[PDB]
Design a protein around this ligand. Structure first.
Ligand SMILES: [Mn+2]
Ligand SMILES: [Mn+2]
Ligand SMILES: [Mn+2]
Ligand SMILES: [Mn+2]
Lengths: 321, 322, 322, 321
């Protein structure tokens, strides 16, 4: 059952831009994201912390918000111009989705924004205006040995990947890689607007749930340093999977778990997908190299755990099996 | 400044720089540099022409080496977004009064319908959409060399009037990610992009038209260091012109080397995302030395005096305006 | 514990582990793994034997691959400080009542006067001083592979009685850089060195004598990652047994892979200096999981069950004591 | 004119171990060594700072001492046992050199020591006893992106290299590499006791002067980070030479200058020299690759500037041309 294709154009989406995460103990979460991982504080107060990666100039890539139930409040995408916020609102209203528009934004440093409960149950935000901050690209005096340099993508778990895929294609995302069986059925898909492998990916499973949010480092040694530092801090039990090389995406990856169990991917090595006819790489569902190029052992929790997502009232979306 | 007119018709929708056609005087000696020393991958070749691509490329080639009498650059080729944009490119340059030549079957093997033009700054530009796809070698780690060149990134052009050049490329849709200006606001150099990296081409002020360099990226810094180590072992370190260093403008960890005819190749790593619509332009002052070298590396005079000739559409060098 | 007697004569002055002689069942298939996949350099070879060395080696070889009926290790060879120390080695092991064999012209090509012994733990040990020097390829960056193995570092042996083994190697002059003990002080494993790195050999408790692995170093971490990437591209990733990971004991960034006969090769990088006379021994508790994996990587069962047979001086396998 | 070979044995030297440097403004020097370079403070007071590298367990690798004239007070070598301190004293006394023995040491954390004005005018110290401190090898929580992991060597400028070479050979050092002309005359030599390329090197020139003291990093990217951080701190004019690859030693190198002009080499990649017949690599004096494998331009100051050294009274040794 495909989502209908609207008669109005999709909003012109530039890239994933930030995620709003609800955490149960802000101070313990700050230790993880700032003291362990080195993300940069744009600004913070007692209940909210705004973080950005090294090469970011928009206000933030992560908003950590204290709350009663750990969950993801919003997956935010930046659109190309103010008119595209109006386009986003019109598109989701034609789809019959719940929408909420706030001229002054939902998170600090972001202006006119529309949030929607999308067709797959996810809270998506579209915005254009954002407060610019000092871009720390060349602030090597602040560079840590495990520096996270850029926000790259989201990964969502949903029960019907083919439905999800066609919905995101209509939204303008293109598939750089997918996993299919012999009958041509899509089991997972990596989808992009910007010129990397993906801005989001759809993973088959119980959902809506947030599988992970991902940041890139400049080189492989930076990822190894994150592992080494976690070992020295005696929190290696928070390293869930990796380091490894994924066949799909070609990423050298690491998955770690924050204090509430939210999964963060840190990776490096991506490749250019910007040409109009970029060739889709289709992996067979039985090729193990799709998961691990090197054959690394399977970690069960990577296939069972994922974060709840919220609706526009701040309540968890029930997870459908 | 005599600015190039802004045409009444839309600029072609340019996706990225895509390849350069370089004329070399001794093809076998050039093949030893680009293939045996640098490891670029041969798409196909014959007695007079070699088609090369980088590791992560799927279009037919990123460099064409063509045997010829005078070392020079025959074409700077950009890939456009659809077949219709080749028609748009031809109409745009015809309105500007520039010489154009259209070939439905292409000018280089593996490329289809193309238009070449002698642009307003005297450079041979090509716009094409169609290209033969080849095996994308991204995950062919069995072919991966210690100094592997993974992607073609950009061109760098020398022209006498940078303000004229900048406004012409802005009209063509390129945006400025970084520039060098004086206190009065005059542009001395500019880095301009269509794809989401620092640049697809840059303008350097000087006698021109000339080609300053063509650049490839590696995955990491150690790959660049290995190119220098290998050139030292082969006793060709005198072909290392400048670097390794870190440029303040672009933030690139760079290396400039010279091919057998003196054509300059940049190998670099580290770039950053410029795809947002309001990406902030970084303006460097003309007197900030760190714009050239973040670490203060000594100036190499040839980098400011030598650059390659470019050809007109008849295959003859364009005169250098001094 | 039945300790090996401490001889009345001095132990031979051992400089470092130097090479291992490995018997393989299909020499051509083994050559494809060690030379085509791993890039080790061929010193010389013939139809039945291949002599290999790492990039920075100047002695004749670090590995000898010998075709034979049963895959096993024929010798663990250590280089001693002078010709006189070969005489010292022979006298030491004869006093211990061990079988010895002395060959003035060596047991493997490129090695001179050597003594081999069936040591107190059942292992075939060789001590030699003289070796043919070959081109040290340290700066041959034109031959440098992306996953280059630069140096032979150590052996790792499985034996049933680690306390007996440790005291025997201490008497031979090896010092313990790190060990694993329980609250009672019993040694479960020990890393022992003569040269100034963490170890030349290590003792692992288990059925033995068996050879757990032989290890080579790379210059940097990315070189190890490239070995895994290349094995993935060649569709031989099932020969990657364990890693990459960081061991707490030794601090090594490691990778264990398996040759065609199942012999285990460690490739690692990062070691530290142990040459001071009072270098502090790091004792890890048997229940500290980080001793095995600093990052907590999952346990690979085969790493604790599989290890290679070793041969006696007649070329027959030494029985495994269980 | 060779230094005579003593009838008593040379002290059994293990490795170079630390350098005592006099600086004119301790606070400005602390900013360089600790805040810029990340060396670890063992202990410090108002007039002296004791620093060590990441993998060191002896008390220190550098002692920074406030004083009126920037200079090097001592090049210290660790010997193999307490008896070797007696051996060192006997050896230099037979050579007619000035000696001073202090059972309680010259610098904190070092025990019984003998200092000597050696035959080439350098202040050398030999000691065995030292206070052990926490070895920070696995303290990845303290690891900086440009971490200096080990002290490797000293490099001295002296007018007569052949005299210097034979003197250090008699002392037990072996030559791993040298630079000679066609007649076989030694112009420079790299000499070692431990199993790396060198513990000291002799450079021909006006002396006695200290050319540089060197620390290793784990990998090349750590050296590039030091350069990047110095650029961000707008102190790139303190980067004197590099990064480059030396042909002699095969080191990937960087030379920087502290606040008083003292030269510090940071490098990586060395190779094993421990076998008894390790082959000496002799470079011709006209092979430019001996200096720079890549051909990097010559930096004049690297051949003209070097630090004064002190005598046992704390006064500068006059520099002989
Ligand atoms: Mn991901
Ligand atoms: Mn460039
Ligand atoms: Mn091992
Ligand atoms: Mn040095």
């Amino acid at each position: 059952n495909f989502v209908p294709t609207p008669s109005v154009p999709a909003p012109d989406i530039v890239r994933c831009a930030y995620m709003e995460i609800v955490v149960t103990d802000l101070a313990k979460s700050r230790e993880f994201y700032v003291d362990v991982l080195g993300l940069h504080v744009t600004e913070e107060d007692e209940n909210t912390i705004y973080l950005r990666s090294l090469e970011e100039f928009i206000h933030h890539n992560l908003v950590l918000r204290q709350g009663p139930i750990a969950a993801v409040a919003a997956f935010a995408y930046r659109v190309k111009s103010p008119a595209e916020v109006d386009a986003a609102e019109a598109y989701y209203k034609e789809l019959g989705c719940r929408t909420e528009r706030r001229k002054e934004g939902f998170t600090k440093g972001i202006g006119d924004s529309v949030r929607v409960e999308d067709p797959l149950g996810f809270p998506y935000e579209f915005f254009y205006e954002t407060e610019h901050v000092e871009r720390l690209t060349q602030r090597y005096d602040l560079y840590s040995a495990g520096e996270l340099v850029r926000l790259d993508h989201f990964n969502q778990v949903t029960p019907d990947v083919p439905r999800g895929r066609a919905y995101l294609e209509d939204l303008g995302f293109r598939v750089s890689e997918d996993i299919k069986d012999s009958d041509g059925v899509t089991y997972a898909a990596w989808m992009h607007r910007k010129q990397t492998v993906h801005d989001t990916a759809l993973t088959g499973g119980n959902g809506p749930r947030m599988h992970h949010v991902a940041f890139a480092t400049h080189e492989k040694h930076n990822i190894i340093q994150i592992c080494d530092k976690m070992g020295a801090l005696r929190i290696s039990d928070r390293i869930e999977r990796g380091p490894g090389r994924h066949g799909v995406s070609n990423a050298f990856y690491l998955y770690i778990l924050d204090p509430d169990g939210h999964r963060i991917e840190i990776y490096t090595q991506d490749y250019y997908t910007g040409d109009p006819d970029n060739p889709t790489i289709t992996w067979d569902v039985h090729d193990n190299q799709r998961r691990d190029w090197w054959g690394n052992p399977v970690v069960p929790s990577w296939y069972t755990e994922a974060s709840l997502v919220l609706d526009l009232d701040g309540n968890p979306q029930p997870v459908i099996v």
